[PDB]
């Protein structure tokens, strides 16, 4: 396999480290890509806030920094064909879907959707990255595609990318992902109707500060 | 040479417009101008295509009155630091304070020019925060007045003109085709969706 | 106590003039800088980046499927798929990439480009395809004899997926890069017969750009 | 040495006058002036003396009233780059752009100077070119309002003096002897065609 | 002969290079020269055009970059008497006889007298060169006389004279040639009344770039 | 004689200058310091 | 802070002076020369 190494670094250390139950490949529950999907996006210093060892250390200290090793596998028949673009996004701000400029009218996405957790959560219209900002130059990311005729697997190793050397994994998602299926699926009759995504991922390198018992 | 960033943003535009009317009853006189650089859509375009900035600015007052004659009359402008309480009134002791630079200049005099450093928290500033406290980076205010002491009856009109300089930019994104809704959110249309490449007749020409 | 004499362009207001004000904070020493990683230091560092070009921009087209060139096997064994310009700084399928918006900023441009293809198809489907470049003067052509005589390369779907097409010198008609069915789109039994052409395209090192100037995309 | 080219060129002499009325119902307020040194006959002549030239400029804005007092007044001067649009009216957004770069200046301070370099996409400057595109070669333009807020109801008349320098000229031809018919254009007379030398009595003589 | 070298610079190379056919010697027909003649002159890099293999590889190229060696012969008998005036002119623009101040109401020359073409053109005003130049001081340029009592022949080695490098063979004459008449032609009754006058030029060192099929 | 240009800036009076003054007295010189116990340099020192 | 006196002459405009102007467009470079064929220098090159 090809590894994109993000942006030429190597995630490393600059608190405690774990360096033992932490460095462990979690596994997410895979997505059932169809003909009508749209996307998916998930907010990581989030996704794993509530699975083992991870997420405690993680919700009962203060300060936090770590990078990250992704493997995003999408196994399909070879009649089965489209494409995926797989992308990192240093701070994905979701962005609010009206046409109101009054402060307090104007709407803004919920807890849910900025923070989607272990499940995930689609997008609403993938060409403008429910961001205002247009996917046809989103290649500017660290990125790979997964063409379902030449391979079926992507990595993406992204280091720490932040102003602040320490903060809060909670309150501050530092990065999110992005799948997309910018070529559709298409099959013939008789074939598995839906194809399924597994995304793992290893906590390089983490460090945590200040545990409040 | 004239593509790098320091090209690319040290030019010295058009930030903000600042009223005054210092008249009877409504004696407000003094006007503050919280400073940010997302004013023009044109600045912000060109600011959000990156996600880290740092940089200083020089900024440069150029007063004029309603119909355009100048007299000559002193005029106080004084930078508010980020945590300092802004002035109340025209003649509230904020206006006294030593912590609170200030510049003395008549309006016959060439127009007044500071420069203010680097001064966030964090080691840059950054335009989109994904998370809770929009974030806690801020440059200050530029209160200003007219320095007299019996009431002045005229309305000016200053210009604050800011030059970018020492521009340095981290992790670059993508630059925002849709239009803009709000100031401080990056809010598109969900409908009317513009596309970014005009419409033609086929796909077998070369319109 | 030096004499001194006062010459034209005193008083005055230069905006581009690089000259040093007063500090305002004295002393005050801002925050130390650390290694965030991922700095930019000339724009020519995001016009090397390979960008999906719309260049299906018809209308009756939804948001995401105007970023891709259908292929199927209804067409005919010789037959035009593709075609669009070269420039750039034009409106077109060029206004989507990232080229095409920062080569907005500046008002000359010179140097080459790169075209490149990708198929999304099923893995049993092949089939030959000639991309054809064709430099400024006369139009676009109208047989695919008269494409193979101009520039051409000819891309099969067996072993290569993704074709690369370099496009030299080009400036402020501009060229044009036409797409031709070869020979057919076979596919077994069992498989839609009916897939997709990612087009991407960014500049080269020999693209430079000169003269600043504000640009027309806001309002 | 005062035959060399550069002493031949380099003197300021006088290129453009621009009005401005900046009135009521005509609220033009600005004046723009496409530059071009083929204004008055003289220069022209001598410019017309060689086929390439390569230079610098230097601008001197020498603004007036209509009787001649000069009273203290904020004059935005504004050079438009070839290939940017032009202000359409006073108080358009081609005014506050960034690109277009502005001289603030009162009435009462001496005259304004800027410097424009070599800006043509050719190696040098061409006046004759025998082909199908008058050729491409432009300087830019120069647009002047006056900033106020309230509108000024003075009539200005500004001189703009250029002076060439670092100039370098190729390819020698003769000085034209017949008028002048048009600007772009080197259209003479077909009659009246006026001699090179003012006629004399006969041959034998030496009037 | 006497070689003039046009400001003493040999044409030089700096795209493809026939140097074959196209390097040979292309003659074209010789001009009839009277006693109430005026003068001729000839647009260079389009009077070769239409004539063979150089008028094939300008046509169907894009960019073009030569000099020439040009040879002008007038043979005339012992008895006749006469000069004439051959002079090469970069950026020879013709102008427009007329009396006109107005943009779409003065006169312009037409397609036919910009570019002449292989069969050259006549002048109206020799005086003024049709340029409202007096040609008094039109020896300022390369250029010879052709003195029929003392020679024949006449030759000029012409470089590239251009601003840009590379500029299109079509659509702008480079520079043009000249031959005027300045002493009239007289001879006795029961001579020939007409001289030829022949023309021979070689482009040295072509340069063709961007060919369109 | 040297030829000079005024820039923006001018005539202003910016509080935070570290710009000279003329000095009332020349010459005069003051009453020379002694070893007076307890110097303070930083406010470091008071929060210690 | 240096002590300075302004002589006649102060704020004229001399047709003849040799005086630098501001820049306009800082930085940006001219498109470079080439040997075009036919450099004048003097004009005593013409009356020759």
């Known amino acids: 396999a090809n590894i994109v190494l993000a942006y030429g670094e190597w995630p490393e250390y600059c608190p405690t480290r774990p360096d033992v139950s932490v460095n462990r490949f979690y596994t997410l529950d895979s997505k059932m890509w169809q003909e009508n999907s749209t996307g998916w996006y998930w907010k990581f210093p989030d996704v794993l806030n509530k699975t083992g060892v991870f997420g405690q250390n993680a919700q009962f200290h203060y300060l936090y920094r770590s990078g990250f090793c992704l493997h995003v596998q999408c196994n399909a028949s070879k009649f089965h064909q489209g494409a995926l673009l797989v992308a990192v996004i240093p701070e994905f701000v979701i962005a609010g879907r009206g046409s109101n400029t009054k402060p307090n009218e104007a709407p803004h996405p919920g807890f849910t959707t900025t923070f989607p957790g272990t499940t995930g959560a689609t997008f609403h219209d993938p060409y403008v990255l429910d961001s205002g900002v247009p996917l046809s130059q989103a290649l500017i990311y660290p990125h790979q595609w997964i063409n379902l005729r030449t391979n079926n697997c992507a990595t993406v190793i992204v280091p720490y990318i932040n102003a602040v050397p320490f903060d809060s994994a909670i309150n501050h998602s530092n990065f999110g992902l992005i799948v997309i299926p910018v070529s559709p699926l298409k099959y013939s009759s008789g074939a598995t109707t839906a194809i399924p995504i597994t995304i793992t991922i290893a906590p390089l390198n983490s460090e945590f500060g200040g545990l409040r018992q | 040479l004239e593509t790098t960033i320091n090209h690319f943003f040290s030019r010295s535009g058009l930030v903000g417009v600042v009223n005054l009317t210092d008249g009877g009853t409504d004696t407000t006189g003094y006007a503050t101008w919280d400073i940010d650089i997302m004013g023009f859509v044109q600045l912000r375009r060109k600011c959000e295509m990156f996600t880290y900035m740092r940089f200083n600015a020089e900024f440069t007052f150029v007063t004029t009155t309603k119909n355009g004659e100048a007299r000559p009359y002193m005029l106080q402008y004084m930078y508010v630091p980020p945590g300092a309480p802004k002035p109340t009134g025209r003649d509230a002791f904020q206006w006294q304070t030593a912590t609170n630079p200030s510049v003395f200049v008549k309006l016959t005099d060439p127009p007044a020019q500071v420069s203010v450093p680097f001064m966030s928290p964090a080691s840059a500033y950054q335009w989109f925060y994904d998370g809770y406290p929009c974030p806690n980076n801020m440059m200050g205010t530029f209160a200003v007045r007219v320095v007299s002491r019996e009431a002045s009856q005229l309305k000016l009109q200053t210009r604050v003109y800011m030059k970018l300089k020492h521009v340095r930019a981290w992790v670059p994104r993508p630059i925002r085709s849709q239009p803009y809704l709000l100031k401080n959110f990056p809010n598109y249309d969900s409908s009317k969706i513009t596309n970014s490449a005009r419409d033609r007749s086929s796909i077998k020409q070369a319109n | ?219």
Not at chain 3, 18 to 44: K, N, Q, R, W, Y
Not at chain 3, 145 to 170: C, K, N, R, Y
């Open chain 3, 1 to 219: 106590g030096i004499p001194a004499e006062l010459r034209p362009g005193t008083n005055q207001f230069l905006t581009t003039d690089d000259d040093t004000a007063a500090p305002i904070l004295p002393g005050f020493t801002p925050t130390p800088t650390i290694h965030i990683p991922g700095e930019v230091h000339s724009l020519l560092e995001l016009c090397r980046v390979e960008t999906i070009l719309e260049v299906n921009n018809t209308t009756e087209a939804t948001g995401l499927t105007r970023l891709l060139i259908p292929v199927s096997s209804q067409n005919k064994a010789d037959e035009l798929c593709a075609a669009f310009m070269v420039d750039p700084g034009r409106i077109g399928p060029w206004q989507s990439t990232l080229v095409g918006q920062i080569c907005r900023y500046y008002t000359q441009w010179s140097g080459s480009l790169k075209v490149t293809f990708m198929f999304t198809g099923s893995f049993m489907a092949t089939g030959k395809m000639l991309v054809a470049y064709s430099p400024p003067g006369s139009a676009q052509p109208a047989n695919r004899e008269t494409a193979m005589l101009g520039t051409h390369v000819i891309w099969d779907f067996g072993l290569q997926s993704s074709v690369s097409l370099v496009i030299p010198w080009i400036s402020n008609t501009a060229g044009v890069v036409t797409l031709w069915y070869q020979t057919n789109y076979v596919v077994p039994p069992e498989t839609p017969g009916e897939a997709y052409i990612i087009a991407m395209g960014a500049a080269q090192d020999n693209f430079t750009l000169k003269i600043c100037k504000d640009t027309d995309e806001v309002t």
